[model samples]
Target chain A: ANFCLWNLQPIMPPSVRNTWWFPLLNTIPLDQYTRIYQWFMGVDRDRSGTLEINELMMGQFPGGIRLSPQTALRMMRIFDTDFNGHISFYEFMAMYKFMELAYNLFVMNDRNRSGTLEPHEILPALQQLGFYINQRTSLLLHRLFARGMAFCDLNCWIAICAFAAQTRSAYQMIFMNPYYGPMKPFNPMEFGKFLDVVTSLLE
Target chain B: ANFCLWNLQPIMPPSVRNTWWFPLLNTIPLDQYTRIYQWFMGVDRDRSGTLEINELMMGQFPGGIRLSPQTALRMMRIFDTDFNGHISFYEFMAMYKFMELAYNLFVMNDRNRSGTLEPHEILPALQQLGFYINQRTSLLLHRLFARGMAFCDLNCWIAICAFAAQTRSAYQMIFMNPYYGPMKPFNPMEFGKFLDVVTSLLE
Candidate 1:
């Protein structure tokens, strides 16, 4: 069967049809924050504090790829999995991992402790994986994102980012975070403070 | 870098971690009993009417690799994302997509429709993603599971079968028997069925 592999963001951009980013996004957790954030913000060329599409492409991302609102939102939401309405450290790392995997698959590199990845190393991996990075691929990757900057689709992207961040925050606070002990007692009064202020705001 | 595409399961599992499973299992609204029961029974390969380890290891999984107890339990908890004690259609499908992605990446199939994959397709994806898969990957996947499963090594395998069955049940209900949803209503009378059943059982 001819698998579209469109939703397979690691190998390529998401397809317009049958596209869903939530599955991939949901799998990322907050603990991955530190390294992922360092990686992305490290490439912040303009020192703009936050990443813009242009900065992401020119500095952190070597190729000329343009992220569409959908693509950016997908990455943004994943990096913002905590859904506190912004990208947290763990969410940021998760998004970085996606970028790294995508770039690694698209490009080549040698694994012999060489710090940088080269095209020669990447081509074989794609070839071995059974995909072809031909002219069609080049064209497909080029058009994968919105070519120009516009905030028309920013709301959805921001919404997704907020929700993801919130979900992650809930996961950590209510479910996944281990520090809230098996033996430790929770104070309703202390939680009340959080409930009245920041926590409720997040909810 | 040397990469094994076939080894992506640790990055994500075929199902849930254990600690999450129990709470989730308990949360599953029993009104969907017939639907869930059928799905659960279906995954019990030998028709034992309960999940068992052998059912999972006897070549029931998609790949030939045998699942360790730790890995299996983690998968189950993941399958129960809604935190209902039982598996639901939503959790099953979400987990399934990631499984497909992991499986395909593991095998390193290209978009060219090739059926088999090799290392080249695998390594780059891992390294580029900034994660590495090694012997510890199995354990890493196991540890992310909820705390209970992290401690109960044996139950992990049983959990896998349970999850598989739950997934099977969900699929059967959605694909084979669409009428199941119509039978259950959210009204007070429908909801009170639980209270009546609990009262009778206690009495």
Candidate 2:
């Protein structure tokens, strides 16, 4: 896929740049036959036992900046292992493990804990793992951060607004609220207004 | 509300409009209690036990075309009664019962057995229940439908794309899966492409 990358610095933590196992999850089909242990890890951005909404979105694109919606949808299904519409910390861990299992062979080959074990991550990791991490890799990484931020913010806002208006609290929006159930493109004008009000509170 | 009539209708099925129990739920203070019963029966648009996502979004309004996002948020929360992120048919019905109890009050007052009551059905029922459907009754109903259709279509597209992409098979989605989910807005661009393929499915 043609990834969109801008030169903007990331709003996410810098630790996101660390090498992770999501690179191989992209190639493996998450079918019923797919082994959960072989692909996906349990929350690359795990905040203890609880999985934040942003972490799961970020996890889907851990290998780079932005992944296609098709790629996200593929992974979302896996992440939402319980099929209650939303992904909990436990469910995310399961999906993450599935991705890890998918790339076990590749993970085993990269002896040095340099990060990645494939040509894809090698370049981004600066010869850290499987990639050489050259100038082009740097450029790609920049794009990934830029594009990933855009997707993250957009999806995050939709999820939050949908959840807040419905449940009165984001933490309460664990599994079945609009954040997951009403997971469609909604008119966010009111939602935008809501965020503006909430952000103003932060100031 | 600047109430306009429906002109450019969206792709979603328009919710049936103007129930007699428009403003009863909000009549109680937010902190007071769960108007869960009033909410369940009151939110039903087609007067069916089932809650269509469109009906939830459209909700009761006070004018011609505009819908209320605040109202939708309530519906979404109530529908997600289990505090899980998604509503199964059972949860949907359980939520509906609270409204059904409220509806029973109205039916009891309809001593004439007409099976339908206008402002006549509502005023007595409200007075008996110690509340009223205050505001521009018909206007809210009309706009609720018009705007609900737009919101529903928007949300539907958002959900359908993500849901379709996530599921191993379309067979898994029945009824409401085509309506909403976590990766909504981003999912739309992907769903648009999917609709194209579905369009060609006939060929």
Candidate 3:
């Protein structure tokens, strides 16, 4: 019953969700990178190139999930690929890159855009997102989300990130530079690399 | 800043941390497994043998982190290995088992029982946990936790879980069946099997 209003707000709107890849792909049409970069700079307080646990905890998070220093610390460490005490821009990018893909996948699967994903669209949504999970995995996801007549929202995005993190280097490389893909507006070829890497991991 | 005090608590104490295996090993002297089982039953309001997101959200989590239904949903999905709509007892066991191992490893490395791990303890801790990680991985972990200041609690726990989940199936089989081990008191011979399995995963 201790629900916060922030939980009710969809983490990202359709406009933001749809265009998340722009920053990662270097297609500065909307200046997405600048928006994220500015936010980072604002939080870095001392203007350190990296972020400490408190700096991140004080900043805006992807899903509006107000993180405690503990959660904030865990999250910072996740993107701090070098395991450094602080999070560098690239490390932040790795985390953002993962979030962008996951948020997009969640939005795509929410065919109804009801702010949550329904059971029917789970598998297809994953396919569209470049993850062709096996029938068993698909079924399990469906049951987990839809069994009790519930839907998946931003938390499901977290699940995808955590699950993807379980894969090998190539899959983790989803955060790597975008040069491997084609010129952007975010075409399928630009996203195909994701599908290839994920499919191989699932295999 | 909207910080939550719950995040400040050390995830696991030294005694519990040191022998996290004691509970899973069935050495009930510490009452670890019983506490977890009781919690499971408390959350299973309908005695339905499975838990929905609502049920899990209402329950207190291991660390004091208050889970939004969003975070709650993701955590459920992690242990819902079967992908079933609900979390089975075995699924809960799987999650607890992973936590036990991770906590024990964390404690083992903190020889002084300090809340944080020292730089020197990193490699030895991984070795004790059956993870003979290379210098690069070891350094990565050290810098993330030890470099800035002190030791770990939840972030360290997350790192351990993320790292362990990546191992092959045999390593994951930590949740297979209690029968596969021993009846009670947790004989070393039975637990040694786990050490062997993890060691192989490291290789």
Candidate 4:
């Protein structure tokens, strides 16, 4: 039990962004949740009553994008948060709301009404959502989310946002625990210091 | 060959933010990468020559937070991009850069300098990182990232950022394919339309 990392970090699934931010089940009207539930069941192509990685990857996003294998695994990992290896109606309802949330955010920001976003538009949009960025942040956002551009379409938008959120969570757990203390601000020297700390911790 | 999702959605792993956005391995000088790699082996608590989820969770962040079990798993999923069931020194280097990027973003945004962030600071920070939002996005960010917060400390900041990025990736893969067409904007009526489309696809 004690063979763990030096500090006791509070761990939750990094994919919480997938399941947690969605509208709660009780919050949605019974009628509406029902239709969403129906959709979830039908997607269970094998009729397992719970959606598996197999059934899930076989489905499409409401926006019409197909669920790629890796994408399906990611969703499966999160939606089956109980880690039941399948998605129940409760889980599917959360997924539905998540889809709705991602869609609306993308649509609102696609100010050009072209079903997509341009580079200049993204920074302002992210600012609107509560992310502040400088040139570096903007650059990485482009590198990862846009993969060198063309469009920050709804699909790209959702991926980028989730990517940032999850990354932030992992960093916080690994490096920045207020209870533990402040992070060494990055510098050429700080890299050496980091290794020293790891060396010390291990020895 | 086509026993897959309807509409041929382009599926990719939902967690691309982890390995994909790091400064390329070639971008860093050999000396720097070597030291970082050395640090990587030092943390392989098991001395297996590769970092496992156990060794990873046991290690602290360059910022000092310990890795939680779930957080470790998430990192393992992405860092071991080859799916070798362990993290290579090369993979650890990518993780190191990711830590640097996230740390810089949080410090730049934590204007109050409490070693943490406040609700007011987050949106601007997210915007800085290129996430746009509205009341809904703001509210949800507060909920998932803050967890009814007392702080947007570096830990929370990293979680939220990665969370947003991963979510965006999944959305792009599932629902909003530019190749397919425009999505039905959400409304009371749109949920039903989504189901009808799903039904149509099945038939």
User: Which consecutive 10 residues in model 1 chain A have the weakest lDDT in total?
Assistant: A194-203
Q: How much lDDT does candidate 1 score?
A: 0.35
What tens digits encode model 4's per-residue C-alpha lDDT throughout B74-114?
Answer: 56644666677888777777666555556777776666677
- Between candidates 3 and 4, the one scoring higher on TM-score is 4
Report the C-alpha lDDT of model 1 over B115-157, residue by residue, as the tens digit: 4322234324433322333423223223422244423122232
Candidate 2: which docking quality band? incorrect
Model 1 interface CAPRI class: incorrect
Give the alpha carbon lDDT tens digit for every residue of A1-203 in model 3.
11111111222223233323223333223466677687678768789777888887677656553344444554554555555678766556545555555565666556666888655566666555545455555545544323244665665545543443333222223223232232223233323333332322121
User: How much lDDT does each candidate structure score?
Assistant: 0.35, 0.33, 0.47, 0.53
lDDT for each residue of candidate 3 in B1-203, tens digit (9 for 90 to 100): 11111111222324233322223333233556678788779878888878887887686545442344544554554555555668766566545555555555665556677756655566566655545555555555545433254555544544433443333222223223232233234233333333332322121
RMSD of each: 23.6, 21.2, 15.6, 23.5
Q: Assign candidate 3 its CAPRI class.
A: incorrect
The per-model DockQ list reads: 0.01, 0.07, 0.02, 0.02
Off by over 4 Å in 1: A1-38, A42-59, A62-66, A108-203, B1-203
Residue-level lDDT for B7 in candidate 4: 17
TM-scores for all predictions: 0.22, 0.20, 0.38, 0.39
Predicted structure with the largest lDDT when compared to the true one = 4
Best by TM-score: 4
Fnat, model 3, is 0.00
lDDT of 1 by residue, A1-80 (tens): 21111233432222211123333444345664455556667756556555654443344432333454444544543343
Q: What is the interface RMSD of candidate 3, in Å?
A: 18.1
